[PDB]
């Protein structure tokens, strides 16, 4: 299976593989009265968001029932360019007005549960460079087929340091069953509303890993599938921010495993000059504050 | 202090700094009947080891009482080239014949406690490219001065991903007091025999971080100093091995913090081709087996 795999192919828990042979029209037939929402979280991606929407556009009013951009505080042209591309833009305020806003990606995805209605929600990063139009159908495939699958995680090929050095080694240490997950931190994935609204959402960059572990702990490995997305292009992370991202992944995973995190942010020491004559001290925030299951706030 | 610092300058626990103004001859006078051993662990570094010894050579029979290369299973010309450079080569077998050998750096450093005699032991990696001749005196300075200092950690400028993304964020999470340590994984450091023989030694690449945490837990922050080594050149780590190194750092730190590690090695999935058609599954070993305090085996 891993010795021969294609963009679309599905990996299940019991080491078994599947190469899908359906059309998108056949997949919409498999729905059986289930609705699909696509949510694109966006903080300042005016350059790429149009192209991302365009890749998913033609599925709307067919496979996809709604396409939402969750505007996470953008001050560029994200909103207007997303509207011109034919997406409904919902701000964090509009999504859930009765709860004060916290910073970070986790917050945005959590709020999008209140703004969306689909029985199935698909998340796709809005900074992807020319995403394959088959991303969404490939992600929903294993949910619409039905093996008691509740979370579909993607894997892909680089055309991350935090994934390979932090998330995956800590998973081996603390949740070794999740060692089969190739890309635990990836932003392209799909899940049932059932699962999503029943679990807490980790803050900031902890969100994906928290969901992964929460899904595993509550529903076991059989509820998780992996799908090959093929080549995944996206804008590279600036090197400065990787320490902060790692620290948050660590905080979220420790908390899921019942290990007390100090709540103390990473302090980085940045050499000011070539000789190392002076260092700039930079401390990034880390959060231990999950949001509760959406069922406790805005229940269906 | 961090806003103005020089190779040699010392950082203590109470945020206080020190710029040393002694000669190496004045430092040998400060000894007061204390012996200093330099230990160079070496697994296949025939190209660099001569130069490393040459940088420390002139201190022998003066500041340094003995200079030992701990040969960790070399099959190149490490031994003969280290002898020609004027170092005493001791194999892992010769160091401690009554205990079976385990693989890894930790093993080598632990055995070197049995092969060396100095009241103070200085460790220096043998793959350093043209190390500054003042490395050893800069490392022993804070021990010979006396503030109840038992461990001297170096920091330096790149002319690591695992340090910045794994070791330092996990320290903030689990031992936030150790957040002030710039280079927790560095191989250039000095300590008393007193401390070194009283603590367990972590296996493989866990060794430095284990010592750091063990020192902190038992003697507190005041027993640890940091010294600026300046620019530190060394051969770059091949990218493949970084996952394995991270996994071991994780295992060692978790164990020091009382957190159960699964003992399950990191499995890496290596794309065999550009499309991501097939993956090679590669699982690196991780060890949870410390060596006990040398006092329990070969006591002074
Ligand atoms: O506070 C935030 C930060 C990120 N994002 C969005 O979440 C996705 C992932 O963000 P980023 O690209 O920085 O994360 P990475 O690729 O490094 O995992 C992108 O579409 C961002 O626009 C967001 O909505 N709110
Ligand atoms: O099993 C081992 C592996 C490493 N080394 C030595 O320990 C030092 C650090 O090894 P390496 O350069 O691979 O570690 P890194 O610089 O990546 O921390 C070097 O002098 C190696 O020759 C050793 O004695 N035994
Ligand atoms: Mn991105
Ligand atoms: Mn090295």
DSSP string, A227-296: EEEEE--BPPPPGGGHHHHHHHHHHHHHHHTTPPP--PPPEEEEESSTT---EEEEE------PBPPGGG
Residues in A touching B157 (Cβ below 8 Å): 271, 274-276
Q: What's the reported resolution, in angstroms, to a tenth?
A: 2.2
Please list every residue in chain B whose beta carbon sits closer than 8 Å to the beta carbon of residue A2.
Answer: 269, 278-279, 281
Nearest to A225 by CA among A10, A20, A26: A10
Contact A173 B243 (CB under 8 A): no
Enumerate residues 172 to 191 of chain A having a beta carbon within 8 A of any beta carbon in chain B.
Answer: 172-174, 176, 179-180, 182
- For residue A292, give the nearest of A96, A149, A143 by alpha carbon: A96
Give the number of the atom of ligand 1 that is nearest the alpha carbon of residue A185.
Answer: 18
Which one-letter DSSP state was computed for residue B28?
H
Is the CB of residue B261 less than 8 Å away from at least one CB of chain A? yes
Cα A46 to Cα A81: distance, rounded to the nearest angstrom: 7
Token pair in block for residue B124:
């220096």
* B156 assigned binding-site residue: no
Nearest neighbour of A157 by CB, restricted to B6, B156, B276: B276
Where are the domains positioned within chain B? 1-300
**A292 to chain B, closest Cα gap in Å:** 22
Q: Are A9 and A19 in contact (CB under 8 A)?
A: yes
Tokens of B246: 């991270």
B152: three-class secondary structure by DSSP: strand
CA distance B97 to chain A (A): 33
* CB-based contact B42:B49 (threshold 8 Å): yes
Nearest to B128 by CA among B53, B218, B190, B77: B53
CA-nearest residue to B273 within chain A is A157
Residue to test with chain A: of B3, B132, B169, most A Cβ within 10 A: B169
Q: Whose CA is nearest to atom 19 of ligand 1?
A: A125
All residues of chain A having their beta carbon less than 8 Å from the beta carbon of residue B138 are none
Instruction: Give percent helix, percent strand, percent coil of chain A, each to the nearest 5.
Output: 40, 20, 40
A81-98 core/surface letters (b: 16 or more CB in 10 A; e: else): bbeebebebbbbeebbee
In ligand 2, the atom with minimum distance to the C-alpha of B126 is 20
Question: If you count residue pairs, one on A and one on B, with CB atoms under 8 Å apart, how many are there?
Answer: 142
Helix (H) or strand (E) holding A101: none
- 3-state class of A103 per DSSP? coil
Residue B87 CA, chain-centre distance (Å), reads 19
Q: Which residue has the tokens 């160079």?
A: B40
Give the span between the Cα atoms of B273 and B281, in whole angstroms. 14
Strand pairing category for B120-123 and B189-192: antiparallel
Distances (CA, A) of A153 to A55, A66, A280, A293: 19, 21, 38, 20
Q: Are A276 and B2 within 8 A, CB to CB?
A: no
CB of A208 closer than 6 angstroms to any ligand 1 atom: no
Task: Please tell me the distance between residue B257's alpha carbon and the centre of ligand 1 in angstroms.
Answer: 32
**Separation of alpha carbons A115 and A38, rounded Å:** 11
**Terminal-residue alpha carbon distance, chain B:** 39
A203 with A265: CB under 8 angstroms?
Answer: no
Strand ranges of the sheet holding A10-11, from the earlier edge strand across to the other edge: A17-18, A10-11, A224-231, A151-157, A189-192, A120-123, A36-42, A66-71, A88-91
The answer to whether A200 touches A130, Cβ cutoff 8 Å, is: no
Decide: B192 in ligand 2 pocket, CB within 6 A. no
Method: X-ray
- Ligand 1 and A95: CB distance under 6 A: no
CB contact under 8 A, B271 and A174: no
Query: What's the gap in Å between the CA of A68 and the closest CA on chain B?
Result: 30
Q: Tokens in use for B197?
A: 């023989």
Q: Does residue A270 belong to the interface with chain B, where contact is any CB pair within 8 Å?
A: no
- Judged by CB atoms closer than 8 Å, whether chains meet at A173 and B261 is answered as yes
Breaks (C–N over 2.5 Å) after residues, chain B: 159
The reply to whether B14 touches chain A by the CB within 8 Å rule is: no
Out of B162, B261, B279, name the one closest to residue A2 (CB): B279
Residue B246 and residue B266: Cα distance in Å, rounded? 9
Residue B136 C-alpha, separation from nearest chain A C-alpha, in angstroms: 19
Q: For atom 17 of ligand 2, which residue has the closest CA? A: B237
Cα–Cα distance measured from residue B28 to residue B11, given in angstroms and rounded to the nearest whole number: 21
Distance B129 CA to ligand 4 centre (A): 9
Query: Could you please report the per-residue DSSP string of A17-29?
Result: EE-----HHHHHH
Q: Which two tokens stand for residue B195?
A: 């401390």
A163 in contact with chain B, both atoms CB, cutoff 8 A: no
C-alpha to C-alpha distance for B141 and A146, rounded to whole angstroms:
67
Tokens of B101: 């050998």
- Residue identified by tokens 């007091």 is B177
C-beta separation of B155 from B226 below 8 A: yes
Instruction: Tell whether A266 is within 8 A of chain B (Cβ).
Output: yes
For residues A104-120, one letter each, b for 16 or more C-beta atoms within 10 angstroms of the residue's C-beta and e for the rest, the string is bbbbbbbbbbbbbebbb
CATH topology of domain B1-300: Spore Coat Polysaccharide Biosynthesis Protein SpsA; Chain A (3.90.550)
């Amino acid at each position: 299976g891993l010795r021969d795999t294609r963009p679309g192919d599905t990996w299940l828990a019991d080491r078994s593989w599947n190469r899908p042979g359906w059309t998108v029209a056949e997949l919409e037939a498999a729905k059986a009265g289930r609705t699909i929402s696509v949510v694109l979280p966006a903080l300042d991606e005016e350059d790429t968001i149009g192209s991302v929407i365009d890749s998913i556009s033609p599925l709307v009013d067919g496979l996809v029932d709604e396409l939402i951009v969750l505007d996470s505080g953008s001050t560029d042209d994200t909103e207007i360019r997303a509207v011109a591309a034919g997406a409904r833009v919902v701000s964090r305020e509009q999504a859930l007005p009765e709860v004060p806003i916290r910073p970070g990606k986790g917050e945005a995805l959590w709020r999008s549960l209140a703004a969306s209605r689909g029985d199935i929600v698909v998340f796709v990063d809005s900074d992807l460079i020319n995403p394959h139009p088959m991303f969404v159908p490939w992600l929903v495939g294993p949910l619409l087929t039905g093996d008691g699958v509740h979370l579909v995680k993607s894997f892909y090929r680089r055309p991350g340091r935090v994934t390979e050095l932090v998330a995956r080694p800590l998973l081996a240490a603390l949740r070794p069953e999740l060692g089969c997950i190739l890309q635990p931190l990836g932003g392209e994935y799909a899940a049932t509303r059932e699962l999503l609204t029943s679990v807490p959402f980790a803050p900031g960059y902890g969100v994906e890993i928290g969901l992964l572990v929460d899904t595993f702990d509550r529903l076991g490995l059989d509820a998780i599938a992996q799908v090959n997305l093929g080549v995944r292009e996206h804008r590279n992370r600036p090197l400065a921010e990787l320490g902060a991202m790692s620290r948050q992944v660590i905080a979220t995973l420790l908390s899921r495993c019942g290990i007390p995190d100090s709540g103390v942010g990473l302090t980085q020491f940045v050499a000011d000059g070539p000789e190392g004559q002076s260092y700039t001290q930079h401390t990034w925030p880390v959060s231990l504050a999950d949001r509760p299951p959406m069922q406790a706030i805005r229940p269906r």
